């Protein structure tokens, strides 16, 4: 999966901020959230989120919906490394396994059940 944040902010500066932020905020994981390519739903103003590690994916859905113009007829799916993480996983679990080496977790959203369609 490809994200604008990575293209705009170069690695060693991201990894810089990841290390910093992960040490100030206990029990809060840093995650970047971008609209997927080809997705047709509301854009998200802010990308950079600190999320309680014990917060479920299920709940993270609720919090992101709250922040985009989403009609009821619109579907919404998260993607981590091209795969939909289950609603039962914790943002903590998700960070542990799939955090990249800048210490960030990258999640894309879309209205299509398959990334980038």
């Amino acid at each position: 999966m490809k994200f604008v944040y990575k293209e705009e902010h170069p690695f060693e500066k991201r990894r810089s901020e990841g290390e910093k932020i992960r040490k100030k905020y206990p029990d809060r994981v840093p995650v970047i959230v971008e609209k997927a390519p080809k997705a047709r739903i509301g854009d998200l103003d802010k990308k950079k989120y600190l999320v309680p590690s014990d917060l479920t994916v299920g709940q993270f859905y609720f919090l992101i919906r709250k922040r985009i113009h989403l009609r009821a007829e619109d579907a919404l799916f998260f993607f981590v490394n091209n795969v939909i993480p289950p609603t039962s996983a914790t943002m903590g679990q998700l960070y542990q396994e799939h955090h990249e080496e800048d210490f960030f977790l990258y999640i894309a959203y879309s209205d299509e059940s398959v990334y980038g369609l």
Partner: peptide
């Protein structure tokens, strides 16, 4: 700070209202 902190407090009452156990 460019980071937005999400807190469960937003959800907490909702979950009660919808009947979470």
């Amino acid at each position: 700070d460019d980071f937005e902190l999400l807190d469960q407090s937003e959800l907490d009452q909702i979950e009660s209202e919808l009947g979470l156990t």
